[PDB]
Amino acid sequence: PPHGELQYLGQIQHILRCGVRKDDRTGTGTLSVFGMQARYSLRDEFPLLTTKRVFWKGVLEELLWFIKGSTNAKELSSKGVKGDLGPVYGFQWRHFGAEYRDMESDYSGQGVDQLQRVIDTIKTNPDDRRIIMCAWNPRDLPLMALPPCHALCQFYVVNSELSCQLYQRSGDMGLGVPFNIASYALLTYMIAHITGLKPGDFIHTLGDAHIYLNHIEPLKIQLQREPRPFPKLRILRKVEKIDDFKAEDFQIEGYNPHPTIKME
Amino acid sequence: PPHGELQYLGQIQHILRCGVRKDDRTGTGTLSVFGMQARYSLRDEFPLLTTKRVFWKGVLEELLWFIKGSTNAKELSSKGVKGDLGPVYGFQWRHFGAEYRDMESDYSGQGVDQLQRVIDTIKTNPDDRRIIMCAWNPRDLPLMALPPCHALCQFYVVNSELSCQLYQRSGDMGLGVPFNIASYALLTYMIAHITGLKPGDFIHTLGDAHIYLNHIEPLKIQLQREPRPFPKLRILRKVEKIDDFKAEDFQIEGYNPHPTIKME
Numbered sequence: 001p002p003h004g005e006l007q008y009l010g011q012i013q014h015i016l017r018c019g020v021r022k023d024d025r026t027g028t029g030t031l032s033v034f035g036m037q038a039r040y041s042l043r044d045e046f047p048l049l050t051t052k053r054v055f056w057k058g059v060l061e062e063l064l065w066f067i068k069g070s071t072n073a074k075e076l077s078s079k080g081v082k083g084d085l086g087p088v089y090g091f092q093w094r095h096f097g098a099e100y101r102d103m104e105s106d107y108s109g110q111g112v113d114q115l116q117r118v119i120d121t122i123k124t125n126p127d128d129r130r131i132i133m134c135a136w137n138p139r140d141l142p143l144m145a146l147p148p149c150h151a152l153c154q155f156y157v158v159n160s161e162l163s164c165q166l167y168q169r170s171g172d173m174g175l176g177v178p179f180n181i182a183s184y185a186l187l188t189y190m191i192a193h194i195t196g197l198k199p200g201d202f203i204h205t206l207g208d209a210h211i212y213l214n215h216i217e218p219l220k221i222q223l224q225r226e227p228r229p230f231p232k233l234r235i236l237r238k239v240e241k242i243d244d245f246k247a248e249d250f251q252i253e254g255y256n257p258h259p260t261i262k263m264e
Numbered sequence: 265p266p267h268g269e270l271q272y273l274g275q276i277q278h279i280l281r282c283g284v285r286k287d288d289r290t291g292t293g294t295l296s297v298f299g300m301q302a303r304y305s306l307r308d309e310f311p312l313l314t315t316k317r318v319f320w321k322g323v324l325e326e327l328l329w330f331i332k333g334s335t336n337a338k339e340l341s342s343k344g345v346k347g348d349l350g351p352v353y354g355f356q357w358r359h360f361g362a363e364y365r366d367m368e369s370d371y372s373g374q375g376v377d378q379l380q381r382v383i384d385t386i387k388t389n390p391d392d393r394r395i396i397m398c399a400w401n402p403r404d405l406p407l408m409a410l411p412p413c414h415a416l417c418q419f420y421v422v423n424s425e426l427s428c429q430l431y432q433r434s435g436d437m438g439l440g441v442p443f444n445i446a447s448y449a450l451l452t453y454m455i456a457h458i459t460g461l462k463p464g465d466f467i468h469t470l471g472d473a474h475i476y477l478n479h480i481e482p483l484k485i486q487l488q489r490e491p492r493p494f495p496k497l498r499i500l501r502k503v504e505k506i507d508d509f510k511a512e513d514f515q516i517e518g519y520n521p522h523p524t525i526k527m528e
């Protein structure tokens with residue numbers, strides 16, 4: 001049986017020559033490849049990278065924050081991970097279209113609730129191919145008219161198994177990717193749990209897969225680390241609404257990672 | 265050196281058990297897999313499937329039609345491939361947002377011109393990661409509020425090479441996929457030609473990759489066919505505007521396919 005992490009490791013190796021130099025919005029250098037995909041089983045295991053310790057605390061805490069539709073940067077910083085932070089992911093996932101006044105204004109029932117709509121569609125028409133949700137980059141909102149939507153993450157159902165595919169126009173292989181894998185795999189676990197489905201697969205598809213220059217050395221060392229069996233996520237309680245989730249409902253098990261690896 | 269077609273063939277083999285039964289909008293049966301990707305080199309070759317004769321005439325003629333932003337079904341049927349057809353792909357690629365009155369109304373400068381915007385961004389900021397364009401399914405437009413966008417096809421530039429990645433929420437492996445591969449590879453050739461870039465790669469990413477039941481037999485026979493070298497597309501003329509392209513500007517060469525394969 002193959003390992004899911006060998007995919008990430010292998011993608012890193014592929015970027016490191018056969019990667020091409022390319023500057024980003026800031027001008028910092030990176031090695032980039034266009035077009036990548038990887039599949040992670042969510043069946044009796046959670047894709048929490050082992051070749052390095054992933055900040056699971058931040059993953060969970062940040063997700064609960066986005067699910068709360070909160071645009072209050074303080075509401076996250078107080079949770080132990082990091083006031084008006086503009087219309088971030090949360091405001092889009094719950095109020096897609098509604099105009100953001102401030103972190104104190106009220107948006108109940110305002111704008112399209114992408115998240116709930118996915119849940120509803122899962123339980124009213126699981127064969128649907130339009131179970132898509134659609135985060136944006138705040139920075140682009142004012143830039144032009146009708147900007148494209150940094151990431152989108154179509155869901156799929158079959159044989160009582162909920163799968164998820166995340167597509168990102170650009171991916172930070174060194175820091176972003178490992179975090180996002182776990183992140184969306186968690187979201188999938190939540191959606192699956194409230195829809196009465198079993199986690200199936202999580203597919204991560206990228207457009208511009210890039211490695212930042214100053215991350216090359218740490219990553220080269222990380223490639224020399226032998227992957228360990230993925231952990232197991234457990235939802236030790238019964239939840240019916242996505243909003244009713246609490247950081248205490250989930251529990252990582254069997255997580256034996258390699259030392260943490262700092263990256264700028 | 266590997267062959268691009270072995271990917272399509274191999275994906276077909278993977279669907280045919282390890283594929284799962286799943287009904288579509290009509291209820292017809294299909295074998296489906298979630299999450300797929302394939303890369304096709306556009307360097308000195310065009311990804312026109314050889315294991316069967318692809319209707320290149322329709323590909324080209326239909327693309328020119330969409331590029332013309334025409335929503336007149338008659339304007340396509342008269343070209344030898346097939347009056348008001350509602351806001352189809354063309355109307356979205358050139359008038360994203362504008363309201364469709366009829367195939368006779370005027371929409372000059374109305375709505376966002378996704379296509380031209382991609383071209384412009386390529387020549388003003390090739391390193392950009394927001395070079396995305398965004399077709400919809402007309403059927404979904406009235407269905408709900410802010411529907412998700414059947415397909416999207418982010419462009420990428422590096423070393424004077426233009427690449428393209430198409431993401432479809434669902435893909436008809438038997439009939440749609442072969443047509444779309446060529447289709448978007450052609451679009452990429454056009455964009456690359458007017459931007460003064462060389463075609464790089466075309467990546468086709470799918471969400472729900474399905475094979476229709478009544479296509480299983482033909483496809484099983486098609487798998488037994490040995491792929492032949494891809495042809496070569498030639499733009500035998502100099503064009504500066506995407507709208508200035510004519511079916512006579514392109515010429516397929518070295519296309520030696522296997523017999524045609526009808527599919528319902």
Ligand SMILES: O=P(O)(O)CCCP(=O)(O)O
Binds near residue numbers: 024027169
């Ligand atoms: O191009 P996107 O939407 O992926 C933006 C993040 C770029 P950086 O802040 O310069 O790393």
Ligand SMILES: O=P(O)(O)CCCP(=O)(O)O
Binds near residue numbers: 130401433435
């Ligand atoms: O679900 P989408 O947007 O891929 C629609 C085509 C479905 P069919 O007409 O029932 O084959």
